[PDB]
Design a protein around this nucleic acid. Sequence first.
DNA 1: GACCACGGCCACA
DNA 2: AACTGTGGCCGTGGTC
Length: 756
Amino acid sequence: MILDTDYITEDGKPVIRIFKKENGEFKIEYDRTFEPYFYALLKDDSAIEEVKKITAERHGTVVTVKRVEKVQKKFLGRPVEVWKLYFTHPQDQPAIRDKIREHPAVIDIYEYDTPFAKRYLIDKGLVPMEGDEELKMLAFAIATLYHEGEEFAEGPILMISYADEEGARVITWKNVDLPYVDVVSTEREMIKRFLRVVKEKDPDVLITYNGDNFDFAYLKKRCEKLGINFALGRDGSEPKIQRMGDRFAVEVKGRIHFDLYPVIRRTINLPTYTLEAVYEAVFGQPKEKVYAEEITTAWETGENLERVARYSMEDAKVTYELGKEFLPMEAQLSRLIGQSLWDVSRSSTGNLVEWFLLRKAYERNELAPNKPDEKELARRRQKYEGGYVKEPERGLWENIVYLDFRSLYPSIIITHNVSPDTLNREGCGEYDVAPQVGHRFCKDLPGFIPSLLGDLLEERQKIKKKMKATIDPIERKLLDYRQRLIKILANSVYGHMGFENARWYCKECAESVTAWGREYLTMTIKEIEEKYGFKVIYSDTDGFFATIPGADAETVKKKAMEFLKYINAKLPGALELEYEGFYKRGFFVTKKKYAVIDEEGKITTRGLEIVRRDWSEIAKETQARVLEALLKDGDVEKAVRIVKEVTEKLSKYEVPPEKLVIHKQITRDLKDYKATGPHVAVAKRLAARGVKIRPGTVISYIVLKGSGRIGDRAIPFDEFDPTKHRYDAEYYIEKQVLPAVERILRAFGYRKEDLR
DNA sequence: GACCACGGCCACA
DNA sequence: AACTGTGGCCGTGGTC
Ligand SMILES: Nc1nc2c(ncn2[C@H]2C[C@H](O)[C@@H](COP(=O)(O)NP(=O)(O)OP(=O)(O)O)O2)c(=O)[nH]1
Ligand SMILES: [Mg+2]
Ligand SMILES: [Mg+2]
């Protein structure tokens, strides 16, 4: 099973290393035969005689075109003659590419910026994370001495905890009487002992929580301050820090550094992404949090240290369990994209799509288009229409059926051969013309994107089929995650065509797809209304809710089945309407905001404040109980009493402030914020206090009784002292709970004043 | 002060 | 955060 790949430089030549695990043994395959290259397009063949002659310089050394080779590839679906230019070292390409492009005899160059090891993975047709081989994992966490105001990593590391299949252990340089703590003399000895533990256990995976942006950099600063070689890598190297956009990432050669934080943030949506909250969400059992002030006082005074040891041990244990749960799942992403687990765990969706498309293009000998330059990026700053959405018939309805298409946009792409290589293709005999926008697509030869999307949807349907017969529930989870991957990947492949910095960009294709979707959905609505007597309550982009005004549930279901058979006979290609749920009742507030109740009593809420993180828990809970009173038995009076009781509880300062916290995320650097909201104000005060604040952190604040501007009277919830603090009950009454319940209870004649 | 455009956040498909 | 478009909704400023 291929773990990863890189390359070293041996006597000026590239040597690919393939790190793998075969028969329970870690092996390193070496390859000195892979030659770096990129493609060039000339207007005349004989011009190559001069193309071989352009040289450049790297670090005093001269860089020359090693060898050239004429090759036939497929650009925009059409055969074309390109020149493969080979080089000695990959680092030659960034230094000579421009000099090649400046030449008048060349039109353009292609596939010049792809990294060497990943190009080796693609060209050799290798897929990592493949096989039944089980890896050994080791999770670890650290405890730090934090005073507010210091710089990063000034204080030493107090405890280093690790965990695996054998249990959890803490290492510390102060005496704690516990069966899982190992006491050493100094911090240096503790770090060295952790290194010895890693070297002896030799895990294939090192599991951390946000180790990409804290634990590893902290250990690096301390290791250099005390003169320790942080030789965690299986080849004796130390963690390599790399850029990951605005954040950082940490590699450990020969191993896989699995940082859970981006995986969890990208997989599950939570109000906060603390280790305690993530663990309680994934496993249901709570985890006690010990804050930095407690451990700082416990270290400086030497008391209550067993509590900090417990916190560190539990940290290591829960990160190990989360790694065990999430790693086999991300291995499926690694197999799907064809890149290393380390890469796919941290890479954005767009880069995942680009790697998948690059691998597919290599498989079909399709010359990959280049990323746009600045002027071309400027041209692509266009605007096209999106999906159709109607103003909902606001209010409460009964006996509702939701009908929606199966993978609307990919099915459109497949059915009409929507692809950049098929758009306005001269000379074909069968065309498909998009509504409104009028773009034509040839259907003689299947397009690149339609082919990939068809394979993907076929695989997803096979996975959903096997899920029904799946016995082993761990496998059920596996195939569920895999089909979710395929779904996200297909939707992102559609979105790729309308992305400015995308290689296979095609605004015409994307707007054609969305016009098709609008046409098909409005057609289905018109047909279900005019010919089956339905009334469409609400309709988003790929489906709608409908009902027979005044009819039995069975009648609505039967007529919906009829309409499905009819409209699916009328629908072409891969386009199919599906019955995806009957609901006893449903309250629709506005576009993207509704709630439905089915037959067994399960409430599905969409868009409402109950599902939003930036709303207070008291408001969410009040709206939830109100919606339950509405949807379970239609007890409007019960809901009005709920809101009156909750507002009286708020007025008398009787509600716990924990239910009063608003969580909002900062998305940019505080310098670049033009409008400063309450969370912005709290973040700016925190940064003024010398607290690390970066794009990604979540500010959790409470509004206090005070002077106007909410941001002036809002403080982080950790600084809330009930003795000297009183939350603004009027704020959370008149502007959190009441507005949340009013948009619902107005449909029964209640104004805000009938609720306080 | 009443009112209103609008960064800014998160959600839905 | 780092494929897209559509939408609701708030806290705040600034101009009448
Ligand atoms: N660029 C982009 N477009 C999207 C996304 N989600 C939806 N679209 C658009 C394009 C999609 O064609 C359309 C439908 O989205 P689904 O509700 O996901 N339909 P499906 O049948 O795949 O879900 P299921 O199989 O679970 O029932 O929404 C997204 O995340 N990104
Ligand atoms: Mg569907
Ligand atoms: Mg849907």
